[PDB]
């Protein structure tokens, strides 16, 4: 539910930092996608 | 062509924004709350270790003091 | 008197023949007189946490007790001094030793002896007169600003058997002699006080007056009271100097104390280089701010106990000046570095860790320090008020406030000037993030504003609302653009822009913004919010009309008033009289009222 | 009868270590007895014997050990445990953390001396609490009703207005004669003024007793501070038949005192470095509550605690949550929107609301209204969490009504003035006026009879 | 019948309370009654075992609990069952034991929960998310199980 | 059979000796009496908990999680009593069983065991909640002797190849199952959807046994090839094309 | 040659196997032979050092390992290298050391792994992801490294 429940270890801290960088990178890549789509979408509407 | 493009872009924006907000409000919060639990319980194991090592060190000092007293 | 070293292991020195010694008593160890605190007693033996590196201490070395716990020498000759965290005088160590180094085991007396100070005895006193702790038995002219009130130590009392006549006396001359229960006490200008003990008071008063910083955001939107407890997120990227220098040059505190809690070597030398060169105008003369401060500096390689003590030393100094009836301000430029020193002591004592590896008593050691602030009625008979304001910076790693020193600090301080790297990168000085920041003293200051600035509480409330509305409206602007907003909301963004760009920003390097008086600050905000109310009335009065007021109409027909609302920041209390300044503000109120009246 | 034997005094301090002084040569040491220590400078201090072994007595010193000396320290052993002097004359008075007076009145002229630890209330003689107290606050009285004799704490994030809620409850508390014992552990002086002032402003002094331990007062006194307050409450309730309310402020500062003492003692640590017995010690405070057979008296408790880093899973709220009869929660998600009092119903419960409601106590509908308000507020939070991902365009009209309910609910049910007093019956009429936002058939927690008696009115 | 030992009653007596409850239950089982035993928390029992260990200075396992915690719980829950009683008349007694573990922080990684779920054949894991929703009984139907179902199918 | 029983009500310390008695009987039966022996050790966690009980009572220095530091050598004196020996026909096979605390594969008991034992058979909560009996998750399971137990004359010669490919396909199956949530079902390609079908059919036909079905190795590899046949031939990339031409077109 | 300690051999024999191995390897290195040596895992040696340290009542440092674990590993790995052998026929032997390092639970933050990485110039980082996809020989080409490239360029 609120957490992934990997068992507490320095391995799991590394894996969760990696998962955080993964998810934050995914957010940034998809934010660029959303911005580029939004620009074209508003251009097309005016056309 | 503008109509089909516009309608397709609207759906693609909704799909993309659902993923962006699911990352921002589900995936990242599960990970950050997990990482807080991992850092917390990792520190709990570090305290439980510290306490055992400290109590061992005190018993050793008692045994050394007793061993010197036994010379009298 | 002295004991002998029995054993050494790192900084821990066990001593013997210490049967007369006390817990936390201060001891000099070895032929070099290394400082340390007794952390345990076990019979006729004592375990001393030696502060300095013990390399070379030997079994059978002397162990000289001081008759005192860790304590601050208080007296004249504090102003201009530089101290380490344990009150050793870094300027005088330098001048006597002629060395770039502190020698291990300094014994230099903290207040410089041999300086005959000019002393005037309190002219009301006589032989046979009654006296109690905190009575001012004479005044020492140590510097032009700070007339040093010599006072009876808080625990001393009795009848004056002698007082020295007017003259020049050094700190070891017996200025007062008194008797109680048939026992004489000889007394000096130097006074010794246990650093971890609160200097007592007649009463801690509720704090009720602004500690004016001379800075628009800090004085208007997030006020700190005289006696207030406050924090700053002191980190490089945020520009922390904008508060601390402004307080040091201008603020309404009679004395200042700095504690370097455990700062980086070069960052410590910035403080020690800078402050000598800073100046204040007093009675139309210009003088160095070192006339009214002492710098308790500590680099990160100062002894752990000196870093942990340094905070308590600075407040123990500040409480002595508070007891002289002065308003002290105390800056503590990284409570986090002090909490690390505290954590190192706990680690060396082999105590159990608590939150994030800090000791259990971190909460208590922070809280029992911040509770040493406040206004007071002093001890002793001339009824004088005074205060200490504590401005204790925090340094949360990555900005994460869940860090226990930061979280416990924000659990205690009533004001938090949340400086932010995003504002500092944009040069939005003083760089305070108004969404993060807060003050709890607003209620208590209502008495002061009601008496002296009666319209200002409305203006402050409206300002905070306009800024909060800017952040809420910015979401709508990001969703659907500025064009999609209501006219009320468009003018709200324009006034919020004036508030953010020309009220809250203040470039302290410019001659006009070096300082900003509270009357100038009120007049500026009064005009921006008067424009807001008149624009909002004009818009709302023309709601559902044929002809309708909007920001573009206002900017077309009265863009001069928008230009003046920005331009008012340039008015100068040095070149312009108060009447001229107030009159220009009153004229802009009339100008804007006529300008809006021409529209609706 | 009085102890007739004369007191021994010892200089045999065989050591000092942290907050402990270790006497030796003691004649028949008594566990938990009180020592009075005179330091070399003539300062008086007090302490309690934490361990005894042969000739040795390990005394913990309340004022701390700074200045204790291995030769020149005189330890007078009183030969008995710590007793609080108690009397009804303690109402209208103020005491420090060790129970010395600070109102400039005299010492407590005792009607009796009571053991500060109290006695375990016999489970056969404990009455199950059921008469309702109105606090006057809708988020309590409408959805978290407090029984006469319940213990139910106010949890809060740090810097929330929990002191104001607790003050308001002291102003507005009543049945649908009374007295308060207020204690604060490690309270800052700015807040100590607020509490003392509020009782003076409400005219309450003649039936409140204050124990103040300030945030700079010696941290071991925090351990006895709530125990003194309870020992006074026990005298007033169980001997004098007063209807007592005990307020214990920042049980977090109490738990910090346990953590500090635990570190100094070297106890086995539980979670976050609190002692492994933190539950029992918190029970020794909290369980001194409730009604007792044959007595008209009652101890109510409303403890308050600052949840560290807002964490509900932290040992302080968590062990308190196990011991106490539900909890009242205050939230930044209400306070940042200026919703005073910032009480969040959703995590809140009161275990005795399942009895201190219904005929003779409150209106018949109360239980049903409370449960339906809980369902609608919870669903409102769930659809708000959906909106944050997929936007309001994905929500149904029913889901949008639960989101609008969550807005109207906070604006009217939770929101209340700091001096505004509302009855439970008024709170239920507000409850129905909110429930009327939905069509009758959606009210799945309310029976058809309760709907027929109350929904259209 | 009740065996009280409330949270403020002496810590040590929690051990005696549990052992008293199962001793009674084994006696009513030997009469041939289908006993049930409630225990309001094995974790508050295990906290008595933690306290005695900490006073004796025994080495802790996880979270301060004594290393024999597993064996104490094992030799408690194994006092359950259906039994052919001792002695002449045959009887089919039982004790059913229901230990309401109270994991500190709500976290099922708690050593008492972990040891308890090692021994018990039925696990009714409650969940604060359900209790916050006022979904009562707050049983989480994902994490819960009953190993007896294959025998009960008959 | 030969049964030693220490139950959860029997005294803790006996269970330290119980596994050593069993293995000593197994050494007599195997290495002196030529029996092929299987040894079952029903809960190595309860054995390690017995070591933790005595170790704590001896005040010994702990290893991680408070177990005795010597538990690795000690568990080795148990697990290393296995395998064929010179001149003997007899052989001690062992299949120990081990209750992982907190479901944690890295717990000191399974961790030190995994270093000593010749793989592990890993039974997973996820497969059990899906009612898959036996719940063996093939991915975290390993067998170090597998590479010499299987091959021509020991099994059908294809058995290594079919098993290697199925194992990679299951791993890809779990990865595309993670994609179905993280990126959504709509992001999956036709190939990824075939790995997802493989994962479902694999649990249903390969993993799911039933408690009295005694499948031969031949029935197992035959079901294996019937599952690998789901993909286009070119997707079976780990298998040599010679083996594919013999067993894919079936 | 092989030195062979099954895991049940006494803890000190596990330590001796490492020092025997390197001393044999150094003996053939002195003949001018380019010896290679492989260890089954330096972590299994560190598990021997842990158990020895615990039994001696030493203060551990991390996860029960002795603080001198790094110095032990250095007194092993720093016996490698090419050498100009002692005595009269000028010859250049070498000992190559392939010291394996599977960490507890697979955690590459582990003390014996980190201490090994502080000493070895090459790290063949085998990876579960490649092994699970049955890619062989399973070396992760983004985590692995070899500092020797600077020399081999000649």
Swiss-Prot record, chain D:
It comes from the Eukaryota. Keywords: ATP-binding, Cell membrane, Cytoplasm, Cytoplasmic vesicle, Hydrogen ion transport, Ion transport, Membrane, Nucleotide-binding, Synapse, Transport. GO terms for molecular function: ATP binding; proton-transporting ATPase activity, rotational mechanism. GO terms for biological process: ATP metabolic process; regulation of cellular pH; synaptic vesicle lumen acidification; vacuolar acidification. It is a peripheral membrane protein. Expressed in brain (at protein level). InterPro entries: ATP-synt_VA_C, ATPase_a/bsu_AS, ATPase_F1/V1/A1_a/bsu_N, ATPase_F1/V1/A1_a/bsu_nucl-bd, ATPase_V1-cplx_bsu, P-loop_NTPase, V-ATPase_su_B/beta. CDD domains: ATP-synt_V_A-type_beta_C, ATP-synt_V_A-type_beta_N, V_A-ATPase_B. GO terms for cellular component: apical plasma membrane; clathrin-coated vesicle membrane; cytoplasm; cytosol; extrinsic component of synaptic vesicle membrane; melanosome; microvillus; plasma membrane. ATP binds at residue 351. SUPFAM superfamilies: P-loop containing nucleoside triphosphate hydrolases. It is found in: Apical cell membrane; Melanosome; Cytoplasm; Cytoplasmic vesicle, Secretory vesicle, Synaptic vesicle membrane. Belongs to the ATPase alpha/beta chains family. Non-catalytic subunit of the V1 complex of vacuolar(H+)-ATPase (V-ATPase), a multisubunit enzyme composed of a peripheral complex (V1) that hydrolyzes ATP and a membrane integral complex (V0) that translocates protons. V-ATPase is responsible for acidifying and maintaining the pH of intracellular compartments and in some cell types, is targeted to the plasma membrane, where it is responsible for acidifying the extracellular environment. PANTHER family: V-TYPE PROTON ATPASE SUBUNIT B, V-TYPE PROTON ATPASE SUBUNIT B, BRAIN ISOFORM. V-ATPase is a heteromultimeric enzyme made up of two complexes: the ATP-hydrolytic V1 complex and the proton translocation V0 complex. The V1 complex consists of three catalytic AB heterodimers that form a heterohexamer, three peripheral stalks each consisting of EG heterodimers, one central rotor including subunits D and F, and the regulatory subunits C and H. The proton translocation complex V0 consists of the proton transport subunit a, a ring of proteolipid subunits c9c'', rotary subunit d, subunits e and f, and the accessory subunits ATP6AP1/Ac45 and ATP6AP2/PRR. This is V-type proton ATPase subunit B, brain isoform. It comes from Rattus norvegicus (Rat).
